[model samples]
Target chain A: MNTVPFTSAPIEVTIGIDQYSFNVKENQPFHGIKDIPIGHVHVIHFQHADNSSMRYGYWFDCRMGNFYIQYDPKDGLYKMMEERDGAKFENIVHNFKERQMMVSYPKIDEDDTWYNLTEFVQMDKIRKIVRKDENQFSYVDSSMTTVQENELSDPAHSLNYTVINFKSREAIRPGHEMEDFLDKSYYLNTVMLQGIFKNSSNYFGELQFAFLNAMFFGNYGSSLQWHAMIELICSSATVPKHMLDKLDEILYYQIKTLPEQYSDILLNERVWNICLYSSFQKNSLHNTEKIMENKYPELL
Target chain B: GAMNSSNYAELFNNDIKLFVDDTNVYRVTVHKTFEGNVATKAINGCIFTLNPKTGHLFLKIIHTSVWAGQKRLSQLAKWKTAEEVSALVRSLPKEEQPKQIIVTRKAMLDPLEVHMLDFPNIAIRPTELRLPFSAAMSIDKLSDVVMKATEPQMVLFNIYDDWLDRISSYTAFSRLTLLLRALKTNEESAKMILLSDPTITIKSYHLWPSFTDEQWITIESQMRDLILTEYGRKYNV
Candidate 1:
């Protein structure tokens, strides 16, 4: 029983005997490679809430499905699940572990490895770091985006595709006006929720700040909140909305006073609307579009 | 001492026969290393001097760890966090400083991207190489880490298949594929050798790398073809 109504033909895939149903979020077409052989369907058992279990995975011949497991499993029951379906199952498990379901397909080795902060970008650029300022050099990146494409991961439909960065504090932050939507409160909220869902607030969520940041600064910053959200949604242990109320409120504040004309070319109120919708969507899988429509029918 | 764990953290290699027009291609592939342990891990990368004695393009790995040591900007990373490595590179005799350092795409826009007032001779490549020495090679029982990208008639197809994933990493498959696919078949001039070491061995590829000497030839030629494309000039020997 998916709350988000599927747009097209509800194609139910049967692994063992039962035709397991799924909720389709987008109206995009089913990849035409549906000629997947019956033999390729990888059936895997999933641990459910009532302590019940069921087999599920991908239509191996032409992948398009889901399931669970991780630590980069190659060919066992876990690999079979990843091959048939997508990464949601592995991600669900990681969410509970206080990890985002995101895998680093990144390159290189050892302690020298450079970690990609997913979609976050340096908000301002310090054109050149003076020798003295080198030690104090710091930067921030934003992962908050409008569309929810790569769920939990960066939404593929990122409203801001520009890779923004700067060299001076006066360099005027790229997204414009470093207005603190919830500066002190973010630290306060993060401190409050870090224990319940550690690493949940890793990235700056849409509603979390006048701007969310992936600060590579001052010996602090992490994937804490992002991991927290992962736990909230995917973890077997559900989190409370009251704890996340600050996020929604901050976002609501942005919607009211967020000057569209004063910002960059694309960082507008419409973008804010999308961010608000995505936040709600992530929180409860609600049809945020319909909810948004109800509020600003004129904007729609 | 050439490439071991204490000085050389992790290292990988690609033999030079793959370059386009190479004959006396006696270029240095400096295996990089961390000067010492820091609050954070130090950079352990390398530089494949794309050119010959006539060349000095220091293609440094911003962050490599095959225990492969290189000179100059090889050991790279976050500034202060990288104090020891930076000081190590700066203090190194000029003879050890690599030219035109190449870095990982991830480091393309990093602070090092400042390129110049900081360090000259550091050029950036979209991608760089990473090899395995620690995981695959045993101190006493050295292994033959070889492959052939286009040829099937040879041996050593799935050389690291079982160990790479069974105990190693499943992601090695993609890394090997990326490095391999980057290799071409300039069969004529690609008579170079693939990077090797009783040392480096982080190559993650295959299902049938049958361990034939011919496979090594295939890899050398393919890798040579790739390097030559980058180096591009023939120093009229």
Candidate 2:
């Protein structure tokens, strides 16, 4: 009999601009894309074929409807095609505009208007437009560049997972594949938090605690626990001090019982050191969004 | 007639018996003496079936080390069996959970002793990982690389009972790949990125530092059949 090896089928997905939001413009430096677009704004593309203007990212005025974005780069200024090959890039800009236009303009019928948008986001169509010089750029697909929130009550939400399309392809980022794995294993943080928050009294729970202690605080064989824990604590704003105390209690209990197995855990020393600074801040310092605010941010 | 090499009489001083019960549980009894006192102790272990067809190595945990009397060596064997069995079973799928394990019930003075043995401190216990090397690299170079990967802290050894019963290439390669992946870094990213790059084609493999290859040469020098079916076929050398 032979042993089998574990293979990795990493979580991967194509991310491109949400084609429904593609805009058309003419006779101007095509200023209609964001490096990282917002929820309402989804489509983005390079200004040129070879290299894009890093500083220049334009948001399309959705009100403009269907129009070609024109710009000059090192190469020729190409027009964004309306419907190239079999793929069509068209979508309703908004239903409100149609209703208003129908009310104002008596000549236009509801269904027979020549100018109307349909939901179509084609990465292939976008590739044809942007990749005029294809050798300079390629895409290695990974997880979400942007995340959207869904209200539980919203029946319109399909909940089917799909990728965001950044209409422009750039050179593959170094360590992109490895970074993908980090995103893939992001649940390790979620799971670790769950284990801490819901400390159980079962044998399985106790064993899990043992593993956690060894994994985080045992400090053996290249431990990245401190950074991961910091990320966990900072991102998870609601982690009360009591939960840390529970971890301490469990850790000490294990150490007392199984000294040989878990004597090296340094959790108690580390948790309280943070608590000393955090105790004075009215717990306001523990806010999750505060880290990105570029303020004083004392505790974090 | 005695062979050129050390015969079974020299390696083994006692006797062992293998039998099976009506419920299909295989039993191993080791008959040995403590000083002058002769007694028989049933070796404490579970039956493990390594299925070649399904590529599954699973064990039925009938009991956990139930040997009694003054035989501590047999107890060691029992403990190793149980420990390895526990590790092996955990890696199997839920569908592959073994129900009834089958085994042959005959042996002739054939004692399955420890394969590769070593001594080290608890502080220096080598954490295990697996790696596979492509044939592009030489064995000597690969040996140096393994030494560098796990310097001062770890050591390699083979604990398989038989030379022919080495771990399968598929199992070892996958394990080693994942193990190397577990230690990911920006520098590690350079190693991985170059692997996929067509321009800079450098074929390489990784293995756990704790896996010993000396046993192969040891087996060869002893005029025994050196089964490199898995390793040789994997590396293509």
> Per-candidate interface C-alpha RMSD?
9.4, 22.9
lDDT (10s digit) by residue, model 1, range B1-237 = 122234221222321110011111112244545765432233322222222122222223323333235233222222211232233346547666543333322332333333222444444233333432112211111113111112211122233344343333323433343333343223223222333333434434432233344554566456545655655644322
Model 2 misplacement above 4 A: A1-39, A44-68, A73-300, B1-237
The TM-score, computed over Cα atoms with residue i paired to residue i, of candidate 1 is: 0.22
**Model 1's DockQ?**
0.01
Docking class of 1: incorrect
lDDT of all the models against the reference?
Answer: 0.28, 0.27
Against the true structure, candidate 2 reaches a TM-score of: 0.17
lDDT accuracy of residue B229 in candidate 1: 69
Q: Which candidate should be chosen as best, given TM-score against the real structure?
A: 1
